Design a protein around this nucleic acid. Structure first.
Ligand SMILES: [Mg+2]
Ligand SMILES: [Zn+2]
Ligand SMILES: [Zn+2]
Lengths: 1335, 99, 83, 50
DNA sequence: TCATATTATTACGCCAGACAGGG
DNA sequence: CCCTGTCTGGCGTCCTCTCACCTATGA
RNA sequence: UUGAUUUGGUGAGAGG
């Protein structure tokens, strides 16, 4: 029907072509009758007749002459909705410049006429004059004029002289502004200057000057001359219940503009003096500016009472504009809403739906069914039948329900599992019965929740509800590989009580010929549900190629494990039920069933799990009592020993032996130790309290205490909650953030007294305030993420590359945190992984790594896999099917089409609620040493010291994988060496961080080069020791006579000649920095490893500051080019740093703020990506210095650290694709033979297809540079202005798109959700393939 | 509460809100993102064009349902043409291009 | 009856084209003129379409072959009725 | 509210997350049957045409 | 009833982005 | 002229339910 | 050709 939406400026001829009549009078309506005004705002001739095909006043009351317009009516003759499309125009007496092009920041008329905003407004509000082609006088064109400047000029240049003001003058300036001429000038000005600031100031002005010439937008279209009025139907005038009309705000705005315009026409008729018509035109200017965007000028106008009234731009922008309130989200027919309840008899593809809601939602299907049978005739009869609800429409209703799915939806839908399609089962009742397992997907408890039902009307929508959105199809969460139909709380208690054991019961050690008579012995009353027993089970192992082989054997098991074996499908082994089956074990039971036997046995087995869990939890009778919370007998003596310890510490505090901070630290330490001891006392007293004999002496076992099974099963409860119900509830913290030294020694079974409950209320009010304010940032994070993603659709099958990121296991310094099988599960390898022995093709180079491949990776102990990542995908406008990976909720690769940006954005932002808002190296294991980034030297004693700061100390095992990693500073005492074998727990590293070592490479004698006591260094003989040290001063304390003196130590031989560095001809002089203290004095012979000086010195907003890419306040500074380094100017704002490369060109430098403790010396050579100071590091520096793969590893590690600290499983594909959407823009460095500009920022796919269709020719391409935009700056900088207008500020984006003449080749998800068509991702990707093919 | 078809608002062609007004459910923004997350392109297309806003689409759909033909004739939403007239009522010339 | 469409997804391996093929078929049965290739257990046209897909007798190629056969039948009908 | 005999146990899944399973003796005795009152106004204002 | 047309409170918290000031 | 406080604008969660209250003037 | 007004907007409170 139509391609792209084009936006441009509105010419006065274009506004007269939209229009149907000039709106003169401001008179709205008659108000005493019902008729409007002829001819006012709500006219007849200008727009249309209120009534359909009627002259409002009187003629044509049938259907013959539609169109005639008599003189007595001055009325058109069409439809009732004809006025909604027709718009009027107000002939503004005095020109008024647009507020969107005068105050957009930056203003469109501000950087175009080369005039400051302040000066532009002055003249615009009749407060300053502006010259326009004066003539032969001493005045510029842009230069303004004041009353005094004009008065004198008036008497001076009375002849050829022009100096107007207001929009009129502004219009002229714009009108008489040779665009083309300015281009060359600006272009020549940019090529004839070197000023950095000017360059950017000139490139931003020429960009908007050449863009205006590229389109059909004129400079004189900025000023509004023929103001357009919105259709009445769109500014509706309806009365509320009563006798008055509740009028809209736009009618106030238009009525004021028309009142003022009529006054201004009458004053220009009457020839009023100058100051009267200046105030009149100024009031018209402010009235127009208030109509368009109210409140952007000084304080907004108001009708009733002090609240400002809502203008047109406030009908567009905001949370309640048209995008976010009526075009992205709509209210919807065939929909319903009610309170949910359980109904556990359901199968997990069906839900209960009440009869009253079912007869209301399915009224047209029932009408069609009733008309088909022949029971009635006309539609009315059917509506009377279902209004009466006779006895025959319920069979009609059960025949329209049967195979027709519905979309259930819980009201805060965060990820895609919050809309699932069921089949209805009709309910006597008024509450939606919802299958319990599905509740863990919706985050739906049953404490008063409500859900909405939606009906797929058409046939393609019924098939999408059955084939994509059915609840049997969503059994794996799309964020990872974990099953989302995990059995939640009652059913794991029923299983944990069923499959367990006790050392004596009915039927101990009897033998049973099958699981059927195991259940028969449980039901008849001859054995117990947990009584250990040899049974004969027949497990089917499918060891052949798709053939199930039976093996039958006698397992020593219990009765309950055989009864649960009657429900397990064929292929799973018996050892999946042989254990005790908590919650992690039943989750991996369903996961192994899904990986082996597929989907249909896993659906039917999930239902049979839920049924048998509910049934035996009912048979269990697992209550909770007051006696179940067993108080430790050792608890009171532990509290008295802690009270004796705080008594000892305070008796030392009365005598002043210890400090106050050490007292507070000792009290918090002994109460933490006593808390851990009380928790261990109660945990022994709960986990093994049952001690029952069997045929003789006693024997112990794990307890059948009720609260212990609710904790050990993982149903509801943890260690901390069961700790607070029996042991002491810790040391609660006051809202100051610091802890309180007197704990809450009473649990909940004993009574809390008053003060302890008040401290508890501190600790809990902080948590409720944190959740109720955290949810806003979590939701706004999901919004920013799905609007930066929004476009990215799997659109190929292979990009045809060999690049991809290097997935290693991540190791922080403790034991190996996340194994390689968690990171390289289901992601397609980049090059073929060599087997760790020698040069073998273990896996090929384009294989998906599912579980079988990952097990053959874990057997061979594969180091790290080079795997394909989304950020390395070469596909223009989308992601190919291999560089994404596995489907994650489907076992296979991602299909051609499935929108991965939206599921990724939801999977990152959905755990936003669970996240929070507000010496030396000791080895642990026993293995082999390896060093990386190492340049070292052996000292005199033997400990290998390091001459490199950035050395990584890895502990490699005997197999080949890397198990530990650490960072060792410059100059540390390593107890070990390279390639060595150590023992578990042996200290291998040592240093002093408070004393920066200035250790050497060679030996010799020490001379004090440029070290003079009195100006350079100072004499501070030590007080308490006597062994003095010449203390080196810094460059700020010494005066300007000797500030140029750099103290240093250079090593010589026994004669005095300079001992050179081994490898060069340069001596090894070390320039001493500020605040140093000389350790080894003059004449002392040195060696390696000996110092030459003493140098003394996060949750959810972290996720936001990583995706939005803020800078930290003190970033780590780096080096943009390798080579030698040196210092510069002495403290003029900053302290300089000059880097001269060995082979490369010199002139790069950087002025470091000198408040940082540096890392580099003067004789040190640096590299790109090498640190100069320490602290956090901004991602833009990673991108422009190290590489794209470096910054994607930086973001995925720095945000999986937050998601792992709070314990959420998210696969890394989602963070890699939001990282792709961050660094999608690029900047040009060398324009080459293309049509770009020098420092123009252009999107990367554009410049790559440009120089890839030019490089296929003879011409060599253009060399770009990638840039990393934060997510809101990157979604507002898009080549599709509806995508950047449905999101944040619409004023800025619509003026930029309007003055650029931008066009929206739709080509994404939200443009097609706005404009009302098929999404180009899902089922509609075939439709968009067809439409893109047929052009 | 449930709604098949009844009265709507004035300015927009979408259904009213509430229970005291016999109105339908606001199919909000995150539900649209959840349908985009699946392949529900046709479910979303009737969810924002036929069931909600487009007047010719919904009258043709009601007659198509009661004839026994589950098929939608979509058209363009009315609130987007309301957007075009509110943007166009500024000094902005927003259009709809070639066939 | 119908709980999962997994075999139909196996025989048309895209999971997004299953909806389109079964929608084309269920419109051939609903308005439609045509009668199903499979016994119906009082299932609706959705489940009869997907149930035809699972036994491997409807895909995109069979529907285009049948529509070419109907176009040739209409061509022969027009030619043998007029001339 | 009113005081009722309550057992703490899982009963066949009908009290799964926070749900509550109630006998018929609670609904036979009218021991929660509350009474609601609705005011409804009707006015015959002279909007227009008499 | 039918045209006439706008004044005497303060008490968010970042976080970019543009601007006059000065070593 | 390159840092720099300082000022100005622009964000800040979805869905639902109940109730009340709506410009002054004026020969 | 067989019938009608809240959405508009504010404020306050509540549920998940
Ligand atoms: Mg709840
Ligand atoms: Zn007439
Ligand atoms: Zn690729």
């Amino acid at each position: 029907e139509f391609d792209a939406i084009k936006i441009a400026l509105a010419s006065p001829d274009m506004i007269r072509s939209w229009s149907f009549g000039e709106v003169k009078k401001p008179e709205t309506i008659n108000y005493r009758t019902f008729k409007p005004e002829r001819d006012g705002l709500f006219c007849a001739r200008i727009f249309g007749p209120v009534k359909d095909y009627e002259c409002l006043c009187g003629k044509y009351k049938r259907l013959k002459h539609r169109g005639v317009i008599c003189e007595k009516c001055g009325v058109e003759v069409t439809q009732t909705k004809v006025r909604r499309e027709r718009m009027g125009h107000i002939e503004l007496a005095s020109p008024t410049a647009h507020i969107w092009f005068l105050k957009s920041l930056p203003s469109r008329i501000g950087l175009l006429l080369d005039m400051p905003l302040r000066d532009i407004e002055r003249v615009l509000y009749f407060e300053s004059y502006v010259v326009i082609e004066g003539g032969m006088t001493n005045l510029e064109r842009q230069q303004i004029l004041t009353e005094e400047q004009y008065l004198d000029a008036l008497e001076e240049f009375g002849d050829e002289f022009d100096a107007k003001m207001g929009a009129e003058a502004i219009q002229a300036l714009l009108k008489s502004m040779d665009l083309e001429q300015e281009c060359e000038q600006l272009r020549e000005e940019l090529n004839e200057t070197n000023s950095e600031t000017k360059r950017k100031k000139l490139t931003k002005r020429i960009k908007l000057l050449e863009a205006f010439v590229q389109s059909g937008n004129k400079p004189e279209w900025m000023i509004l001359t023929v103001l357009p009025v919105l259709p009445p139907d769109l500014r509706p005038l309806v009365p509320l219940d009563g006798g008055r009309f509740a009028t809209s705000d736009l009618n106030d705005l238009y009525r004021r503009v028309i009142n003022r315009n009529n006054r201004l026409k009458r004053l220009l008729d009457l020839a009023a003096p100058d100051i009267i018509v200046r105030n009149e035109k100024r009031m018209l200017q402010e009235a127009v500016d208030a109509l368009l965007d109210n409140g952007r000028r000084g304080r907004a106008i108001t009708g009733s009472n002090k609240r400002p009234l809502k203008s047109l731009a406030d009908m567009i922008k905001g949370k309640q504009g048209r995008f976010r309130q009526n075009l992205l989200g709509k209210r919807v027919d065939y929909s319903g809403r009610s309170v949910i309840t359980v109904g556990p008899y359901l199968r997990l593809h069906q839900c209960g739906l009440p009869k009253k809601m079912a007869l209301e939602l399915f009224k047209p299907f029932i009408y069609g069914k009733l008309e088909l049978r022949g029971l009635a005739t006309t539609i009315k009869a059917a509506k009377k039948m279902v209004e009466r609800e006779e006895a025959v429409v319920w069979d009609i209703l059960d025949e329209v329900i049967r195979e027709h799915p519905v979309l259930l939806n819980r009201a805060p839908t965060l990820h895609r599992l919050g809309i699932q399609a069921f089949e209805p089962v009709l309910i006597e009742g008024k509450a939606i019965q919802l299958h319990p397992l599905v509740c863990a997907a919706y985050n739906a408890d049953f404490d008063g929740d409500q859900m909405a039902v939606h009906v797929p009307l058409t046939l393609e929508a019924q098939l999408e509800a059955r084939a994509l959105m059915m609840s049997t199809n969503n059994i794996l969460s799309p964020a990872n590989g974990e099953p989302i139909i995990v059995p939640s709380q009652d059913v794991v208690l029923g299983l944990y009580y069923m499959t367990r054991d006790c050392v004596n019961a009915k039927g101990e050690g009897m033998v049973l010929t099958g699981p059927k008579e195991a259940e028969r012995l449980y039901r008849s009353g001859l054995a117990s549900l947990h009584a250990r027993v040899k049974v004969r089970i027949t497990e089917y192992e499918k060891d052949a190629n798709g053939e199930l082989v039976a093996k039958t054997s006698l397992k020593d098991t219990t009765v309950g494990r055989a009864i649960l074996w009657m429900i397990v499908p064929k292929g799973l082994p018996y050892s999946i039920v042989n254990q005790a089956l908590g919650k992690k074990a039943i989750s991996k039971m369903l996961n192994t069933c899904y990986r082996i036997l597929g989907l249909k046995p896993t659906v039917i087995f999930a239902d049979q799990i839920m049924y048998t869990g509910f049934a035996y939890a009912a048979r269990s009778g697992a209550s909770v009592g007051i006696d179940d919370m067993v108080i430790p007998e050792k608890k009171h003596e532990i509290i008295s020993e802690a009270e004796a310890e705080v008594a000892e510490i305070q008796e030392q505090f009365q005598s002043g032996l210890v400090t106050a901070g050490e007292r507070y630290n000792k009290v918090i330490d002994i109460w933490a130790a006593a808390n851990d001891r009380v928790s261990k006392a109660m945990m022994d007293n709960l986990q093994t309290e049952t001690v029952i004999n069997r045929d003789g002496q006693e024997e112990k076992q794990v307890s059948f205490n009720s609260i212990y099974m609710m904790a050990d099963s993982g149903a509801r409860g943890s260690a901390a909650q069961i700790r607070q119900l029996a042991g002491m509830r810790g040391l609660m913290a006051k809202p100051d953030g610091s802890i309180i030294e007197t704990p809450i020694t009473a649990n909940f079974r004993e009574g809390l007294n008053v003060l302890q409950y008040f401290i508890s209320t501190h600790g809990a009010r902080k948590g409720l305030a944190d959740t109720a304010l955290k949810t806003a940032n979590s939701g706004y994070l999901t919004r920013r993420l799905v609007d930066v993603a929004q476009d990215l659709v799997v659109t190929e099958d292979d990009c045809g590359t060999h690049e991809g990121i290097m997935m290693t296991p991540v190791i922080e310094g403790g034991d190996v945190k996340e194994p390689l099988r968690d990171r390289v599960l289901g992601r397609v390898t980049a090059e073929d992984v060599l087997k760790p022995g020698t040069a073998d093709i273990l896996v090929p180079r384009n294989t998906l790594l599912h579980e079988q491949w990952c097990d053959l990776l874990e057997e061979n102990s594969v180091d790290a896999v080079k795997v394909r990542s989304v950020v390395s995908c070469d596909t223009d406008f989308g992601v190919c099917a291999h560089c994404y990976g596995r489907d994650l909720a489907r076992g296979h690769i991602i299909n051609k089409g499935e929108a991965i940006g939206v599921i990724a954005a939801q999977s990152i932002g959905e755990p936003g609620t669970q996240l929070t808002m507000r010496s030396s190296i000791q080895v642990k294991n026993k293995g082999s040493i390896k060093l990386s980034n190492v340049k070292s030297v052996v000292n005199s004693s033997g400990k290998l010291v390091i001459t490199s700061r950035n050395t990584e100390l890895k502990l490699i095992d005997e197999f080949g994988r890397t198990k530990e990693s650490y960072k060792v500073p410059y100059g540390a005492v390593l107890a070990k060496g390279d390639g060595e074998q150590v023992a578990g727990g042996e200290t291998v590293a040592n240093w002093d961080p408070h004393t920066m070592p200035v250790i050497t490479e060679v030996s010799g004698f020490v001379r004090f080069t440029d070290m003079i006591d009195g100006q350079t260094i100072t004499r501070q003989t030590d007080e308490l020791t006597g062994l003095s040290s010449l203390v080196v001063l810094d460059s700020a304390e010494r005066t300007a006579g000797g500030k140029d003196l750099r103290p240093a130590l250079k090593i010589v031989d026994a004669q005095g000649n300079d001992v050179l560095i081994p490898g060069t001809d340069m001596p090894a002089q070390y320039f001493l920095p500020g605040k140093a203290i000389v350790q080894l004095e003059d004449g002392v012979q040195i060696s390696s490893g000996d110092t030459l000086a003493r140098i003394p010195q996060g949750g959810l907003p972290r996720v936001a500051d990583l995706f939005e890419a803020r800078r930290p306040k003190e970033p780590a500074i780096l080096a943009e080019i390798s080579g030698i380094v040196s210092f510069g100017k002495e403290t003029k704002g900053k302290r300089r740093l000059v880097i001269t490369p060995v082979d490369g060109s010199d002139p790069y430098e950087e002025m470091i703020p000198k408040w940082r403790q540096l890392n580099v010396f003067e004789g040190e050579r640096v590299e790109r990506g090498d640190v100069i100071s320490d602290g956090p590091e901004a991602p833009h520096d990673i991108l422009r210095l190290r590489g794209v793969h470096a910054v994607t590893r930086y973001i995925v590690n720095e945000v999986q650290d937050v998601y792992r600290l709070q314990g959420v499983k998210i696969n890394d594909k989602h963070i890699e694709v939001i990282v792709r959407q961050m660094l999608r823009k690029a900047t040009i460095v060398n324009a080459g033979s293309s049509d770009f500009l020098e420092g123009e920022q252009v999107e990367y796919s554009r410049v790559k297809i440009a120089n890839r269709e030019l490089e296929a020719n003879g011409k060599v391409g253009a060399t770009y540079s990638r840039d990393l935009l934060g997510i809101t700056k990157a979604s507002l900088a898009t080549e599709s202005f509806i995508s950047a207008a449905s999101f944040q500020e619409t004023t800025r984006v619509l003026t930029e798109a309007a003055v650029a003449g931008k066009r929206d080749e739709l080509r994404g998800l939200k443009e097609n959700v706005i404009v009302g068509r098929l999404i180009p991702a899902g089922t509609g990707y075939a439709y968009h393939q067809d439409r893109m093919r047929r052009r | 509460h449930a709604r098949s078809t009844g009265s709507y608002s004035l300015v927009t062609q979408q259904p009213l809100g509430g229970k005291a007004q016999f109105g339908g459910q606001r199919f909000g923004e995150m539900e649209v993102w959840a349908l985009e997350a699946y392949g529900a392109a046709y479910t979303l297309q009737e969810m924002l064009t036929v069931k909600s806003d487009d007047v010719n689409g919904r009258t043709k759909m009601y007659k198509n349902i009661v004839d026994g033909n589950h098929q939608m004739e979509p058209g363009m939403p009315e609130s987007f043409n309301v957007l075009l007239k509110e943007i166009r009522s500024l000094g902005i010339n927003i259009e709809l291009e070639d066939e | 009856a119908r709980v999962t469409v997994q075999d139909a997804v196996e025989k048309i391996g895209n999971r997004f084209d299953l909806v389109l093929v079964a929608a084309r078929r269920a419109r051939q049965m609903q308005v439609g003129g045509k009668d199903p290739l499979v016994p119906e257990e009082n299932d609706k046209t959705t489940v009869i379409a997907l149930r035809e897909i699972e036994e491997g007798l409807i895909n995109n190629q069979i529907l285009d072959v049948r529509e070419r056969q109907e176009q040739q039948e209409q061509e022969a009908a027009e030619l043998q009725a007029v001339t | 509210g009113q005081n009722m005999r309550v057992a703490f146990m899982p009963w066949n899944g009908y009290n799964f997350e926070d749900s509550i399973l109630v006998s018929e003796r609670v609904v036979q005795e009218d021991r929660f049957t509350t009474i609601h009152i609705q005011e409804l106004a009707c006015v015959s204002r002279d909007t227009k045409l008499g």
